[PDB]
């Protein structure tokens, strides 16, 4: 499962695009349990892919942007599934306004999973 989310995030930098400039609540800016963090991460990504799949600011105007938008949504939907698979419950409040670009939140999160993965390896 954690091996699987690392595998999804291996192709993170290829996904750093036009739409990754928009904001997201940085649930890493404001300490809770690991299951609470995963739940709050999985929530924010879902909120993003469902609010920007048809957003003009995400689709862009070039052909490259049309394709990159689609692939971003696919990448986020995938990532969200990995995260829920580690979150346990679905009840957690997003009691913070601390915005972050999606790009930053994903790098932040990638660092967090990489620490967890290097802590469970001997």
């Amino acid at each position, epitope marked *: 499962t954690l091996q699987e989310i690392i595998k999804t995030l291996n*192709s993170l930098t*290829e*996904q750093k*695009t036009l739409c990754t400039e928009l904001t997201v609540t940085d649930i890493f800016a404001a300490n809770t349990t690991e299951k609470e963090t995963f739940c709050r991460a999985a929530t924010v990504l879902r909120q993003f892919y469902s609010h920007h799949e048809k957003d003009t600011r995400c689709l862009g*105007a*070039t*052909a*490259q942007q*049309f*394709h*990159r938008h*689609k*692939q971003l949504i696919r990448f986020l939907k995938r990532l969200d599934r990995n995260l829920w698979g580690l979150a346990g419950l679905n009840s957690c409040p997003v009691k913070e306004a601390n915005q972050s670009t999606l790009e930053n939140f994903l790098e932040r999160l990638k660092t967090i999973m990489r620490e967890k993965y290097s802590k469970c390896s001997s």
Partner: antibody
Framework: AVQLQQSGPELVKPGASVKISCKASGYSFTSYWIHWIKQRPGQGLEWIGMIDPSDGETRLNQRFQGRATLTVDESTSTAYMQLRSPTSEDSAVYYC????????????????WGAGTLVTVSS | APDIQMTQSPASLSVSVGDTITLTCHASQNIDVWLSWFQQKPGNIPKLLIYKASNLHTGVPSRFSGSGSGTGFTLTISSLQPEDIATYYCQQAHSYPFTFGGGTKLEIKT
């Protein structure tokens, strides 16, 4: 290796619809968008539209005002283009092509092409 | 949103084996470096030569060369071979709908 096999020539009456196939082989069919291109002697090459074999999403050139319908059968790896209300103006060689991409659309181009299909629309 | 119009010049050109030739392509709007070149031999199908204004497709001989960014673009055939007598088209991938030039037909000098 990678191939796109198109269907044979068509002789159509006006108002009668026409449907051509494009059968992909030698690669994961669902990985790239299939595009359809029109070629008339006077004109040159015209982009009709495209279809995503992974989900059936379709984008068409406004110039084909719901004239061309694009479909896929991923069970047989086949792309289709249906032209409704064809007229003399629709007589052309219709090509299907795949838009190969690298590094998540860093580079994207029409690398492989089908042999074309002559559609003759009777006067 | 208006379609990006692609213009090629000359419409045709007489040529001999050994010649160094340069065909022109112009975009009515900025297309960055999103430009491909195709060769179409009489009665045959379009074949990609160059993608992204200057990158050669695998298998395409080095005598073919591309240049440009923005709106002005070029194709060069150095030491033109008999195989190279064809019609050449450019195609922009900046925006949907994708658009092609009218072509440049190469004709052999008799």
């Amino acid at each position: 290796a990678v191939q796109l096999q198109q269907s044979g020539p068509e002789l159509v009456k006006p108002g009668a619809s026409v449907k051509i196939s494009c059968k992909a082989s030698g690669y994961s069919f669902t990985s790239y968008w299939i595009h359809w291109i029109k070629q008339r002697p006077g004109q040159g090459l015209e982009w009709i539209g495209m279809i995503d074999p992974s989900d059936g999403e379709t984008r068409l050139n406004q110039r084909f005002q719901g004239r061309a319908t694009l479909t896929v059968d991923e069970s047989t790896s086949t792309a289709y283009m249906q032209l409704r209300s064809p007229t003399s103006e629709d007589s052309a060689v219709y090509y299907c092509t795949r838009l190969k991409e690298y590094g998540n659309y860093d580079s994207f181009y029409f690398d492989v092409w089908g042999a074309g299909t002559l559609v003759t629309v009777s006067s | 949103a208006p379609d990006i119009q692609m213009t090629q010049s000359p419409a045709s050109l007489s040529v001999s084996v050994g010649d160094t030739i340069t065909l022109t392509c112009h975009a009515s709007q900025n297309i960055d470096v999103w430009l491909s070149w195709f060769q179409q031999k009489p009665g045959n199908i379009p074949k990609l030569l160059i993608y992204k204004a200057s990158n050669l497709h695998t298998g395409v001989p080095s005598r073919f060369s591309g240049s440009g960014s923005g709106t002005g673009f070029t194709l060069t055939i150095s030491s033109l071979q008999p195989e190279d007598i064809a019609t050449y088209y450019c195609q922009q991938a900046h925006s949907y709908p994708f658009t092609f030039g009218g072509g440049t037909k190469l004709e052999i000098k008799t």
